[PDB]
Amino acid sequence: HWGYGKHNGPEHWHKDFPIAKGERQSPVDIDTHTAKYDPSLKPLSVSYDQATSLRILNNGHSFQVTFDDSQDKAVLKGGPLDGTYRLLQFHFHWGSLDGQGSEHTVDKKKYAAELHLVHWNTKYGDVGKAVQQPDGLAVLGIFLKVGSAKPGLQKVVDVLDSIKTEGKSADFTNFDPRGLLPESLDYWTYPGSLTTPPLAECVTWIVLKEPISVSSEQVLKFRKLNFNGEGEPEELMVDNWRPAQPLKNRQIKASFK
């Protein structure tokens, strides 16, 4: 029922999901001059060597690549986190044009897209239990700008024609998400929420400062996806981003000076 359109988009979500107006909603604008360098923050530990990708899916609001999260094979630790978080899936948010698409903003700058790697805290045993906890999930966010191609994204790009419409899926084995990461793991962090319904306030956000570059041809393939199901009126899957929400009583911390 919810979506990104005039009649069902972000300004409507609070009717079905009243936490949309909560105290720790995401995304936010990252004011780089106000973010506090925290010398107590640890380097982020990203251990993706044993990742097992399974499927690629058009879920009607994004596409996602899903991983085997039945063991500690692709995990996030350290940084602001206590304990071990298993990679469940990654997905993107993007625009109709290159000047919008990201969910987080940096000094009000919007990037062309934003990559989210979604992880859940193994102390809660499954992701459904983790979304009911304030420290249940850790989402690693990476900005995309348009310039040079990202070679590690091309395998994703090339299968999108097979999942054009909602609920369509394909095998997507042996994909290495290390090929989507920038050089630096410098980050901002704050407590927030899922950025789609149910908008649960369960996420430690970790947003990398360094964007990756993707080519215009790569992001144009994102924009050929459809929000609609097969045979329904064709509505390009573009502008699937929630805008920045009020920071309220939160501090954004920087891992770097």
Ligand SMILES: C[C@]12CC[C@H](OS(N)(=O)=O)CC1=CC[C@@H]1[C@@H]2CC[C@]2(C)C(=O)CC[C@@H]12
């Ligand atoms: C897929 C989605 C929503 C979109 C979120 O995107 S974002 N942008 O916040 O990372 C990532 C995310 C995490 C947990 C997942 C939830 C939808 C509902 C699920 C499946 C449950 O019922 C239990 C786990 C829940």
Ligand SMILES: [Zn+2]
């Ligand atoms: Zn997301």
